[PDB]
């Protein structure tokens, strides 16, 4: 499943000094995984480090993870 950054997403993140595709937890890797039902995007090692740290649920909202969908984000450029 491929997600393409839109122009407005690209503008938004530029104004914020970043990119949409960047994982905002580590600010290092790009987002590779979508958490369900909430839909928060992050990289896999952040999900892993969160659980490894005893963190509960989704690293964003701490909601139960009912699913994890691999994804690929195509930068706007």
């Amino acid at each position: 499943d491929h997600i393409k950054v839109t122009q407005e997403q690209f503008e938004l993140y530029c104004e914020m000094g970043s990119t949409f595709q960047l994982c905002k937890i580590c600010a290092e890797n790009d987002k590779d995984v979508k958490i369900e039902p909430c839909g928060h995007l992050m990289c896999t090692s952040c999900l892993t480090s969160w659980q490894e740290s005893e963190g509960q649920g989704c690293p964003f909202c701490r909601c139960e993870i009912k699913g994890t969908e691999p994804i690929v984000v195509d930068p706007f450029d």
Partner: protein, 146 residues
């Protein structure tokens, strides 16, 4: 942790919080300082409060440690500047920005959580005589925060 701390510093430059600032002390990226203006809607109005922020090596999977430097009178903040706030312990999530932490601390100055106190005697006064609590909080602001 470095990459995340680095983006936090950029985010504060891009979008400076209202009545809040933070940044590293000297050459150590893991020890920052913060300032908070006492919210206008509270007994801390007119005060300027200084805080320390220490990022642990496993940040952001563990919360930063945040404490007041400036003395303050408040049910959730003790004489060592320790802050009882849920997002700094059990409610922490890695996605919280320093900016949101500071804003949560300001909300806590406006609206204390006296049923989960760090200083019981202050919480008791807050729950019972609010006019008195306000009076004392202002005097402490005036004494140590101005």
């Amino acid at each position: 942790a470095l990459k995340r701390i680095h983006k936090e510093l950029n985010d504060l430059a891009r979008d400076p919080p209202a009545q809040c600032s933070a940044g590293p002390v000297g050459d150590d990226m893991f020890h920052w300082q913060a300032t908070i203006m006492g919210p206008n809607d509270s007994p801390y109005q007119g005060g300027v409060f200084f805080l320390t922020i220490h990022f642990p090596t496993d940040y952001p999977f563990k919360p930063p440690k945040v404490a007041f430097t400036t003395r303050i009178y408040h049910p959730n903040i003790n004489s060592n500047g320790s802050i009882c706030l849920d997002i700094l312990r059990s409610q922490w999530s890695p996605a919280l920005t320093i900016s949101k932490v500071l804003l949560s601390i300001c909300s806590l100055l406006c609206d204390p959580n006296p049923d989960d106190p760090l200083v019981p005697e202050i919480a008791r006064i807050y729950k019972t005589d609010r006019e008195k609590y306000n009076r004392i909080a202002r005097e402490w602001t005036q004494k140590y925060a101005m």
